[PDB]
Write a protein that binds this ligand. Sequence first.
Ligand SMILES: Nc1ccc(Oc2ccccc2)nc1
Lengths: 344, 344, 344, 344
Amino acid sequence: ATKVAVAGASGYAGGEILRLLLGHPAYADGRLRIGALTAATSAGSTLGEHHPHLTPLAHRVVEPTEAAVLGGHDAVFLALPHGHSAVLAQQLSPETLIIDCGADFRLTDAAVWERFYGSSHAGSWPYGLPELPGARDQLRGTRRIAVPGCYPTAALLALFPALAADLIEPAVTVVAVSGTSGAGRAATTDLLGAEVIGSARAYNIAGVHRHTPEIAQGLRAVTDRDVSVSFTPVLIPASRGILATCTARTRSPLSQLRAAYEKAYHAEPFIYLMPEGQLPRTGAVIGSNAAHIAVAVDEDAQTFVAIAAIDNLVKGTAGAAVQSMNLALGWPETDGLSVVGVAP
Amino acid sequence: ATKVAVAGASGYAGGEILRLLLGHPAYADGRLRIGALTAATSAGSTLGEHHPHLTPLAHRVVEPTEAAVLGGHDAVFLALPHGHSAVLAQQLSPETLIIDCGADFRLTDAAVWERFYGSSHAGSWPYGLPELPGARDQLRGTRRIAVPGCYPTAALLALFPALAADLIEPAVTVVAVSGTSGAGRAATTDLLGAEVIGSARAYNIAGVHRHTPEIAQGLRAVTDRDVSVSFTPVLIPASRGILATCTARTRSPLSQLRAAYEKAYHAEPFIYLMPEGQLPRTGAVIGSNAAHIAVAVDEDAQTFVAIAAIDNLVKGTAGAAVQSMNLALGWPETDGLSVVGVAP
Amino acid sequence: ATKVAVAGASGYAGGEILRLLLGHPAYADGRLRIGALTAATSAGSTLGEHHPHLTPLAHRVVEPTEAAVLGGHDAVFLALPHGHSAVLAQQLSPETLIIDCGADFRLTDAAVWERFYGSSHAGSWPYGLPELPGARDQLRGTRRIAVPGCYPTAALLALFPALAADLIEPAVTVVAVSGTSGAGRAATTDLLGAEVIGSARAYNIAGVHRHTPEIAQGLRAVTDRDVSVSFTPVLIPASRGILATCTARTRSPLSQLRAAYEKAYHAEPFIYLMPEGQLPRTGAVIGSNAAHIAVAVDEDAQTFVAIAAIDNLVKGTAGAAVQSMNLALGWPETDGLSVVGVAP
Amino acid sequence: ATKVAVAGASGYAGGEILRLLLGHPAYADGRLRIGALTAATSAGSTLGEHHPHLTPLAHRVVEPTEAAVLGGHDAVFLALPHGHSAVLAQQLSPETLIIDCGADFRLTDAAVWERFYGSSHAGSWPYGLPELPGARDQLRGTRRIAVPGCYPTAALLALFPALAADLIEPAVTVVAVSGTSGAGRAATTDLLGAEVIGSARAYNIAGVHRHTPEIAQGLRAVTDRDVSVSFTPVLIPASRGILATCTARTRSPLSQLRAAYEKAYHAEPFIYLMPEGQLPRTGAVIGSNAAHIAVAVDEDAQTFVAIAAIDNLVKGTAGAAVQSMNLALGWPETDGLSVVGVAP
Ligand SMILES: Nc1ccc(Oc2ccccc2)nc1
C-alpha cells in the first residue's frame, strides 16, 4: 500500500499525472490510494471544475498546498513553477519519495542555474530519464527524483546515442515544435485560443531558454568534449506535441549511425525506431509514453539529422515522472504506461 | 488593356492569385481583366465549385489547359507549383508575360534540376524575389518570370543580408514550419484533416527536399564561399504560414548583424524588422504579403539565429507572382498587395 | 477630412475596426483620419505589442480612455469591455458620430435589457444591420450607431426573409458554432490554447445567453406573430467565425422560400445565396464582410433549415461598424469592405 | 478463449479497435488473440505504415478482404463502409460472432432503408448501443451485433430518457458538431487539412443524412407516438469528437426532466451526468467511451435542451463495438474501456 499526493494538481502536468494513475494497476488493486490533491490555485473548489476529463475524481476538494496536507504520504508529486519546490522538499519528511516535475533539482552546475533562473541552486536529484545511461540504475529504489523538462527529454533522446558513440561533433542545432499545454496553464493573453490558432511563433530564442543548459548538461555526460546547443523553441497550434529536429555536422556514413540507435535502443520498450524510410509524427505518440525516432545524414552539407516525437505531457512530463516512480518503488517499470497513442 | 489568364486555377495557388487580382486597383479601375481560368482536371465546371470565397467569379466556367485557350492573353499565370510548365510556356507569344509558380524555370545551374527532379532542364527566367539584390532590375519589364518556392522565399529573406556582408558562416541550418496549404490540393491521405489535426511531422529531410538546393542558389548570389544547406520542413495544424528558423555560426556583434539588416530592408516597403524584443508570429502575416523578420546571436553556441514569418500562399507563391508582374508591367510594386495580416 | 478614434483599440474588435480602417479608400486618399487609440488599462504601450498585424500603425502609443482623449474627433469607436460605455458615450459631444460595438444600445424594450444585462437601460440608437429592412434608411446620415452582436447578425440574415414573407412559424431554433475570437481578449483559462484546441462545447444554454433577445427583437421587426427563440451557441477550435443552423416549422414549399430569399438579397452585395446543392462554410467568408446563406427544406419533419456563415469579427462586429459608418458619412456602402474572404 | 480478426484495419474505425484491444485485459491474459487484419487496396503492406500509432502491431501484414482470411476466428470486427458488410456477412460461419461497424444490419424497418441507402435490405442484428432500454439483454450472448453510428449514439443518449417518460414532445431538433475523422479516410478534397482548419461547414442537412432514420428508430423505440428527427451535422476543426445539441418542446418541470435522467443513468458506468453548473465538452471524453450529459429547460421558449458529448471514434464506434463484443463473449462490459478522458 502506497499513499500519494499531487502538489499542483490544479493544472496540466498534475492532472495528467492523476490520469495516468487512475489507469495504473497499483490503484486498480488497492496498492495505491489517491490522497491529497493540492494547489494555491482555487482551493475549495472541486477537482472536476478543473479536469472534466477525470470524473472518477471529480468529487475531491483541493486543499491548500501546505506541509500539513502533504505529510502523511509515502509519495508526493510536485508540479510547480520553479521556486516553490526547494522550500517544500525540506518541510517534508525525507523518508518520502519526492518527484519534482519542476526544474529546482535538475542541473548540477550552480553557476549555470543562477544565470538562467535568477535564484540560488537548491541541489540536484537523479534525472527522471531512465533510457539515458546510468540514469536507470541511480533511479532503482531512489526516494527523490527530478523530472526533465519536456524539450530536453526530446532533445536528449534524439541525440545521445550518436554523441555517446562518437559519431557527430558537439556543436548541435536543435529546433523543436510544441503544443501550448507544455506552456503551462497560467492564463496569459499570448496563450488564448484566438492567438495560437493559426500561428507559429518562436519564443526565448538564441540560447536564452532555461531548457538550453539542460540539453547541454545531459549531452556532456556522454562524451569528453564540451558542448554547445543552438536551441530554438517553436509554439504551434496543438494542445500536445514535441517534434524535435536535431542536426550536427558529421563525417560518418548513415549505415554506421543506424547501428548506434539500434545499439542504444534494442531493449528500450518506450523507444521505437522508424523502419528505414519512415519518420515519427507527434500524433502517433499522443497519450502514449513512446518516443518515435528516426535518423538520416545529409552529405552535401556533412550534416547528420535526428528526429524525435513524444508527448510533451507523457514522456516529457507526467509519463517520465510515473516511469521514474515505477523504478523508485521497484514496481514494474512499464506499469501505467502505454506505447500506443490516441491517434488521430 | 492588359488581360490575364491563370492555369491550374483549381489549385490553392491559382485561387490565391485570383483572389489577389480581384483586389488589384487595376481590376477596380479597369486596366486589367480576369480572362481564361484553366485547369488540368475539373475542366468544365464553375470556379465556385472550387473557391467559395471567389464568389464574384464563382459563375465563370473552367476550360482545360491548352495552347489555344491560354493564347489571346496579354499575360498568363502558370500555377502548378508542382505540375510542370516548361512545355506550355513554350507555346505562347514571347511578348506576352508568363509567370510560372511551378519550379521549372527558377534554376540557373543545371546539374541540380535533374539531380532533384530527374528530367530535362529548361532555363532560368528572372527570379521573382524583388527584395533579393539585383533582382528588381532583372524584373522591371520582363516577359518571363520564375516564382520561388514557399520555403526558399523565407530562408533567403532571413539569411541573405547577413551572408552578403559576410557576417555569418556560409554553412546554414534551416528548420521551417508550414501549414498544409503549401502541399497543394492534391488530395492524399496523409494530408487529411484528422491526420494533420493535433500532429506535426518532418518530410524530405537530409536535404532531400526539392527546395533545398534552391536556397543554395539563392545565397551563392551574395557570397563566393562554399554554401551548404541543412534544411528540414515541418508541417503543422495550420492552413497558411511559414515560420523559418535559420542558424549559422557567427563571430560578429549583434550590433553589426542587426544593422546590416536595417540597412538592407529600411527602404524595402514590404519587409519589416521586428522591434527590439518582439518576435515574428506567422499569424501576423497571414492573408498579406508581409515578411516580418528577427535576428539575434546565440553567444555560448556562437550561432546566429534568424527567423522569418511569411504567408506560404501570398509571398510564398501568389503574392510574389503579383508583386513581380506589377514590376513586369511597371506599376507601383505595392499596388493591390497589403502589409496588414488577417488576424486573429 | 474626418478624424476617427478607437476606444478598446487593443481588443479584438478594436483590432479589426483598425484593420478595416486601414484598407479604406478614404484612408488612402486622406478623407478619413486615424487618431486616438485607447485601451482600458493599457496606457503607454505601443500598438504593435497588442496587434503585430497592424504594422503601419504599430509605432503608436496607447492612451487612456477618458473623455479628455476622445474629444475633437469626428467619429468615435467604442469596442470597450461590453457594459459601461453609455457612460462615456454621453461624455462626448453629441454632433459626433458614435459607433458602439458594445451592447449598451442595441435593445428596444427596457424590460428585456434589465432582465438579461442588469443595469439601468440606456436607450436605443440605430441598430446597425443595413441588410435588415427599414434599418438602412435610419443609418443614413445618423450620428449614433449600435453594432449588432455576432450570433444575431447571422441569425437574422438567415431567418428574417422566410419570416418577412411569413412562410415559417415564429418559433425559431438556433444552434451556432463560432470561433474563439468572439469571446474577446480577456485572458481566461477556458479560452487558452490547450483548452479550446481539439474540443467543442456549448455554453449559456436554454435561452440565457444574452444574444437571444437580440434575435427575437430583430425577428419581431418583420412579423406581428409572437416571436419565440431557442438559441444555443457552441464554441469550437477556430479563431474566427460563425456557422449558424436555423430551424423552424414550415407550411410552404422550398420553391416559395427560395424565391423569397433571392428576392431579398439580390439588391444586397454583401449577402450571397448559395447555388443549389451548396452550403456555406465559414472559411469561405473569413476576413471579408460576406454572408453565405442556404435554404433547404426537411419534409419528413415539417421544418425549414437556413444556414448562414459569417465572420464573427467583420460582419458580426467590425465590418458592420464601417458599413454603417459609410452610410452615415455619406460615403458608398460597400466602401472599404470586401466579399473576398481569405481561404484556405 | 477467443481470437479475433479485423476487416478494414487501414481505416480509423479499424484503427481504433486495434488500439482498444491491445488495451483489453483479456489480451494481456491470453484469452484474447489478434488474428487477421484485412483491407482492400493496401493489402500486402505493413499496418504500421497505416497506423504509426499502433507500434505493438506495426509489423503485421494487411491481408486482402476475403472469407478465408477471416475464416477461422471467433470474432470479426468489420470496419468496412456501407453495403460491404452484407455480402461479406454471408461468407463467415454463422457460428462466428460478427461485429459490423456499418449501416447494413442497423435499421429494423425495410421501407426506409431502401429509400435512404438505395440497396437491398439485409436484416437487423441487435443494436450495440447497450445503454438503451432492453438492448443490453439483446446482446448478452449474441453472435451478431450492429454498431450504432456516431450521431445516433449521442442523439439517442441525450434524448431517450426524456421521450421514454413522455416529458418531451416527439418532435426533436438535433444539431451536432463533429471531428472530421467522422467521415473515415476517403481522401477527397473537402476533408483535406487546409480545407477543414479555420472553417466550419454544415453538411447533408435537412434529413438527407443517413443517420436521421437511425436516430428516429431507437428514438421511436421508447415512446408511444411517432417521432420526427430534424437532424443537422456540422464538421468542425478536430479529429475526434461529437457535441450533440438536442432540442424538443415540453411543458414539464426541469426537476422532473432531471430525475428522469438521474434514474436512467446513475446505473450506467459509461454515461456521465454533469454536476449542477457544468456542461459537457468533447475534449473531456476524448479517448474514452464515456458520454457526458447535461439538460436544461428554456422556460421562456418552453423548449427542452439535452446536451451530450462523446468520442465518435470510441463511444460512437470502436468502444461501443468492443463494449458489445465484451457482452457477446460474456465478459465485463467495462474491460479495456475507460471512462477517464485524455485532456487536453
Ligand atoms: N464579436 C466581438 C468580439 C469582441 C468584442 O469586444 C472585445 C474584444 C476584445 C477584448 C474586449 C472586448 N465585441 C464583439
